[PDB]
Structure formats: structure tokens, C-alpha cells
């Protein structure tokens, strides 16, 4: 903080990362927000691209750890991430921004960011980061009405971790409320511990949406009582509004 060297900023960026890490295991994460914000202005005014990228990522992780999704959105709206940043810092930024967009119903921009975060992720290490981004991208792609890639569930690293989401993706794809609710009642606790439960709940609309899409794609004229049966809705009157 006292020194103003130019090469030290590259060292400083790593120090700030571990400074948030020691408090991460201290479970405070709040006294660092003032330090991170104050140091971010010090880096931004000096055009310290390396420090500014790390400081912005750590703040987003700080905000997202406490579900301060409103606070984190404001910061990313005004602050500009360094274009000449490390690919490892671009990967975190694209994930953190993509997670924010997913909560704010900006699914289309979320999908692009997490896909970019996956691309910029290290090719041989950072398995855990790949898992977390894959888990959120599967939900967003399902939340966007698209279909997740079948290949990612086949990888040895992601196979066990993406299994609850593989069953959930299957339930959404067939577009039946009965199978979607079974996954939720079976893997609800896993999704909650995963930070993806709230985005899973909105998938009920997508299950109905894609189920209706298959109904029109297949039936030239279908009874509303039949539609209620194929979507496992409550009454044909409910299928009438849907």
C-alpha cells in the first residue's frame, strides 16, 4: 500500500488474491471488502491492469459469497474489466458476471460468458472451476430453452459431479412436470449446497415451455385434456391458460 512501484503491482495482484484467501478460511470476508474497494481505486487510477483485474474478481467473489447479487451487478455495470488481463482472471470474471446475469434473468448474456469462461479456463488444471461453471451453464442453457451438450457429462472429471444435473437435464428435455419434480425432490439438497437451487426452480416454466413445443411440433390438432396429460398439468382449464 505504501509503495508505488510498477513491477510490484504484478506481485501485488497475487498478494491480494491470497489476502482474500486467508480471510476466506477465517469466514469473515467482510473486512476485506473495504480493503479490496480501496485498493481497487489505487489500482484503477494508476492503470494497474493486473491488480485491477484481480481486485475486481475478488470483490465479485466477496459479493457473491453473501448473495449480494444487487451490489455485484452495480460494480460490474460501472467498473471496466481490464482487456489486457490474465486469461485466468478473465475466466473468473466471465463466470462471476455470468452468475450475476443468470440471477438477473439475463440468460442469453449469461450463456455466452460462462462458455467464454470455460474456454479461457486452464486446459489441464482447475478441474473444480470447470465443474462449477459447467453446473451453472447447464442450468442457463436449460433456462434458455436450449439443450446442454451431451459430451460434457462423459468426461471423467465431470461425470460424478454433473450426474444430478444430467438427470435434471433429462427431465427438462422430455418436458413433463412429473419427472422434473422427481429430480427436485431427489437432488434439491445437492442443488442448494451447489448454489444453483434458485435457478433450478425457474426450470419448471421451461419444462412446460418445451413440453408445449413438442406438442405443437407433433400434433396438428390435439385436445386440451390430452395436453394436460402429456404435460401432467392439473386440469385442462390450466392447460388452456398455459
Amino acid at each position: 500500500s505504501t509503495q508505488n512501484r510498477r513491477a510490484l503491482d504484478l506481485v501485488a495482484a497475487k498478494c491480494y488474491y491470497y489476502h482474500a484467501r486467508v480471510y476466506e478460511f477465517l469466514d469473515k470476508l467482510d473486512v476485506v471488502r473495504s480493503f479490496l474497494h480501496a485498493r481497487l481505486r489505487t489500482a484503477t487510477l494508476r492503470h494497474d491492469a493486473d491488480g485491477q483485474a484481480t481486485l475486481l474478481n475478488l470483490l465479485l467473489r466477496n459479493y457473491l459469497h453473501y448473495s449480494l447479487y444487487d451490489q455485484a451487478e452495480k460494480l460490474v455495470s460501472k467498473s471496466v474489466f481490464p482487456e489486457q488481463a490474465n486469461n485466468n482472471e478473465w475466466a473468473r470474471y466471465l463466470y462471476y458476471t455470468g452468475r450475476i446475469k443468470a440471477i438477473q434473468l439475463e440468460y442469453s448474456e449469461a450463456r455466452r460468458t460462462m462458455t467464454n469462461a470455460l474456454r479461457k479456463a486452464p486446459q489441464h488444471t482447475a478441474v473444480g472451476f470447470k465443474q462449477t461453471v459447467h453446473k451453472l451453464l447447464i442450468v442457463v442453457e436449460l433456462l434458455l430453452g436450449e439443450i446442454p451438450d451431451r459430451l460434457q457429462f462423459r468426461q471423467p472429471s465431470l461425470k460424478r459431479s454433473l450426474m444430478p444435473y444430467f438427470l435434471l437435464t433429462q427431465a427438462v428435455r422430455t418436458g413433463n412436470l412429473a419427472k422434473f419434480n422427481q429430480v427436485l425432490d431427489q437432488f434439491g439438497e445437492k442443488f442448494q449446497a451447489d448454489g444453483t437451487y434458485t435457478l433450478i426452480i425457474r426450470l419448471r416454466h421451461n419444462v412446460i415451455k418445451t413440453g408445449v413445443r413438442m406438442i405443437s411440433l407433433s400434433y396438428s390438432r390435439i385436445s386440451l385434456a390430452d395436453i394436460a396429460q402429456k404435460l401432467q398439468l392439473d386440469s385442462p382449464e390450466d392447460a388452456e391458460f398455459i
Binding site: 471488502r33 473495504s34 474497494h37 480501496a38 481505486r41 487510477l45 453473501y66 451490489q71 452495480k74 460501472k78
Partner: protein, 292 residues
């Protein structure tokens, strides 16, 4: 804590002025941490400064300046920093104070540079609050004995008054004069202002206890003032310091145009004056050269 400033910001649209004042005293403590959300509520905090009757309208300007400083809109940030008036303490070591100070000087410099070449009647008046802070900024170098730094900003902001003042109050006047002269020709590419710098540089040379006349004539060739050169030389004969004018003339012939020297001869006419034009006409200087 205080993870969301929505509650504090919510204390801004109440009709009780006391309620608003307390919220402002709460925002400034968290403006360095929660500026992102206040940035979407600035329009509710600049109206407080816009209101004339508000008790803390000067405080409202200061906090809005902090939000804009964090936001990066430095042009808007300084405009409210000047609105803070006395509450924007130039003596503070805070990053916000020093960053707005830098933006103020640059903004003042651009106006003065634009104002320098403008005609007098079209000269846009620089704001008094903007001039007052830079004058305190200029005084800091004089207080801190950083005379070379104060010389440069004086040239950038085209203020010859502070430029003149810095050289005189400086401990090493001859050294500062030489440093200023070297900058005046090597770095200044605006002739109309470079002449003004030399027009005051000649004044300091005149008011020196031992007037170093040699550099004066060099500066006067740049200014193209034969009348000044003839006058300073004519009084030199009256003051009996014939040695200096003898050296002065060889410097005129070496580094001045013949039209400049020709105009000096006529003024010299209007014994020793006859030998004086002998060097200026140059038929002596080539004689020593040819003899060399």
C-alpha cells in the same frame, strides 16, 4: 456490515431537512465502499446541492464529487469538488483529494492554454473556485521549496505571475533562471507565449543585483527588440562598464541577423559608440576569424 446503502439513500427524499443531512453524513463514510449503488442515486443528491436553502448543500456537493471520482467521471467529479468549497481540504492526504487536485490542474491548464491564444474579448472567465485551489497548489511548492516543479506548472498554465514569483523567491535565482531559459527554448513551441516568458525573464535579469547583461542580449535577439539592445548597450557606455558591452557586441554579431544588427546601428547613432558599431558591423569579428 451495511451491505446495502438503499436504506441510507432512502433517507434522501424525505421532506425533513434534518433527515437528509444525517444520510449525507452516513453516505460519505461508505462512499469509498458502496459508490456503485449511490451512483444510481446521484440525481437525488445533486438536487440537494442544487437547492440553495439546504443547510448541507456544500456537503452534498462533496459526497457527489466522491461518487463521481470513484465512477471515473472526473469532469463531473471536480465540478462538485469545487462546489464543496471549504469542505474540500487541499491539505488532506486522501487519494480522492490528490486525484481531484490533479484533475483540477489539468482542467485549469487546458482552459488557460485555450484562453492564452484567444482574444481578450472572447476570453472565457476561469472560475474563481478553480483558480483558488490551483493558487493554493502553487503556494505548496513555494512552501515546500520545490521551485523547479512550480516553474513547470506555471508555464503549462500560462501564468507569468507565479512564474516570476517562483524565480525570485527561489534560493538559487541564477540557477533557476538558467533552468527556465533552457526550458523556454527547448520545450516551448508557442512563440507568442515563449516571448512572454522571455519578456518577464528580461525583467528579472534587469532587477538582479549584478545585472547579467550577456543573457539579456541573447533573449532580446529572440524577442527581436533592437531598441532594447541598443538602449541597454548605450547606458552601458555611460555606466563605464565598457568591458561588458565589448563582450556583448561579439555575442550580437555571432548569433543575430544583420537586419537586427542594422537596426541597432541606427539607434546607436540617434568615440566609444564608433568603436561599438565596429564590432556590430562585423568587419572586426571576421578579422579575428580570418586571422585565426
Amino acid at each position: 456490515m451495511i451491505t446495502s446503502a438503499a436504506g441510507i439513500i432512502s433517507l434522501l427524499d424525505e421532506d425533513e431537512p434534518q433527515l437528509k443531512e444525517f444520510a449525507l453524513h452516513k453516505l460519505n463514510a461508505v462512499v469509498n465502499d458502496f459508490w456503485a449503488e449511490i451512483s444510481e442515486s446521484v440525481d437525488k443528491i445533486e438536487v440537494l446541492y442544487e437547492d440553495e436553502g439546504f443547510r448541507s448543500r456544500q456537503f452534498a456537493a462533496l459526497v457527489a464529487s466522491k461518487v463521481f471520482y470513484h465512477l471515473g467521471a472526473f469532469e463531473e467529479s471536480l465540478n462538485y469538488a469545487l462546489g464543496a468549497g471549504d469542505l474540500f481540504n487541499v491539505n488532506d492526504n486522501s487519494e480522492y483529494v490528490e486525484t481531484i487536485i490533479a484533475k483540477c490542474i489539468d482542467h485549469y491548464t487546458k482552459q488557460c492554454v485555450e484562453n492564452a491564444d484567444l482574444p481578450e474579448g472572447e476570453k472565457k472567465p476561469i472560475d474563481q473556485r478553480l483558480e483558488g485551489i490551483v493558487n493554493k497548489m502553487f503556494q505548496r511548492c513555494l512552501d515546500d521549496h520545490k521551485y523547479k516543479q512550480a516553474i513547470g506548472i506555471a508555464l503549462e498554465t500560462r501564468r507569468l505571475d507565479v512564474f516570476e514569483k517562483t524565480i525570485l523567491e527561489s534560493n538559487d535565482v541564477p540557477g533557476m533562471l538558467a533552468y527556465s531559459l533552457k526550458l523556454c527554448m527547448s520545450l516551448m513551441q508557442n512563440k507568442q507565449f515563449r516571448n512572454k516568458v522571455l519578456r518577464v525573464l528580461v525583467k528579472i535579469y534587469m532587477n538582479l543585483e549584478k545585472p547579467d547583461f550577456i543573457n539579456v542580449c541573447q533573449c532580446l535577439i529572440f524577442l527581436d527588440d533592437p531598441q532594447a539592445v541598443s538602449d541597454i548597450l548605450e547606458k552601458l557606455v555611460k555606466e563605464d562598464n565598457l568591458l561588458m558591452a565589448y563582450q556583448i557586441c561579439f555575442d550580437l554579431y555571432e548569433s543575430a541577423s544583420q537586419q537586427f544588427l542594422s537596426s541597432v546601428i541606427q539607434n546607436l547613432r540617434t568615440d566609444q559608440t564608433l568603436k561599438m558599431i565596429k564590432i556590430l558591423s562585423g568587419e572586426m569579428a571576421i578579422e579575428l576569424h580570418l586571422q585565426f
